[PDB]
């Protein structure tokens, strides 16, 4: 099977309307304020749930 | 699956080299036609 006709600019772009990116739940840290992914450790300060985790 | 070109050093000089081209009268036709074109290599 081979395309019998080339596809135009409008139909290409109408195909490409469900082809995007999303940036889902982003919150602010409770300890240091900066934004972070919910249910994840904060990469800026290593605090999750009010305690220090990436330290010893 | 053996291909056609199998390299060898003696054969290439004995079939295509300068002295083989010099020993026949048609070899020298070849060498003159190559010198007349400007080839940097006139005989293998």
């Amino acid at each position: 099977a081979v395309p019998a006709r080339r596809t135009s600019k409008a139909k290409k772009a109408k195909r490409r309307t469900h082809y995007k990116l999303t940036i889902k739940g982003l919150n602010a840290c409770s300890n240091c304020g900066e934004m972070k992914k919910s249910h994840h450790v904060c990469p800026a300060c290593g605090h999750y749930d009010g305690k220090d985790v990436m330290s010893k | 699956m053996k291909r056609t070109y199998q390299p060898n050093k003696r054969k290439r000089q004995k079939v295509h080299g300068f002295r083989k081209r010099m020993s026949t009268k048609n070899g020298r036709r070849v060498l003159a036609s190559r010198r007349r074109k400007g080839r940097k290599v006139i005989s293998a």
């Binding site: 249910h39 994840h40 450790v41 990469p43 999750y48 985790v53 | -």
Partner: protein, 124 residues
């Protein structure tokens, strides 16, 4: 129970290795599917380390890796602990009075070459 991209004997090898780590190190970075399967396996080892007897020891020795050391110990010798000896002398007595739930998982970040979601699994 989560095939993990492997055949039946390679899954078993991989789990036997990742749980002997974390007995020796107590904190590890891994992907998120492996960490769940491993929480299950490691706590099954700890409730044999709490049982204590010879039958339990030989049951664990079918699953804990052997020629691995775990040493922070010297009185005056080269005295080595064996990572099954640690299971039975150290980690069982630690969790004596706790019921199940000897581990916990935290989520960090996706790996650069992969976008694989990574995770830290630790003990207390």
């Amino acid at each position: 129970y989560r095939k993990l991209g492997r055949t039946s004997s390679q899954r078993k090898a991989m789990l036997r290795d990742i749980t002997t780590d974390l007995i020796i190190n107590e904190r590890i970075v891994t992907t998120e599917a492996r960490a769940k399967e491993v929480r299950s396996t490691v706590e099954k080892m700890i409730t044999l380390g709490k049982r204590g007897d010879l039958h339990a020891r030989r049951q664990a020795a079918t699953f804990v890796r052997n020629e691995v050391a775990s040493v922070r110990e010297e009185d005056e010798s080269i005295v080595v602990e064996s990572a099954l000896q640690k299971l039975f002398n150290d980690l069982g007595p630690r969790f004596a009075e706790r019921q199940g739930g000897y581990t916990r998982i935290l989520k960090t970040e996706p790996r650069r070459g992969d976008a694989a979601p990574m995770v830290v699994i630790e003990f207390v």
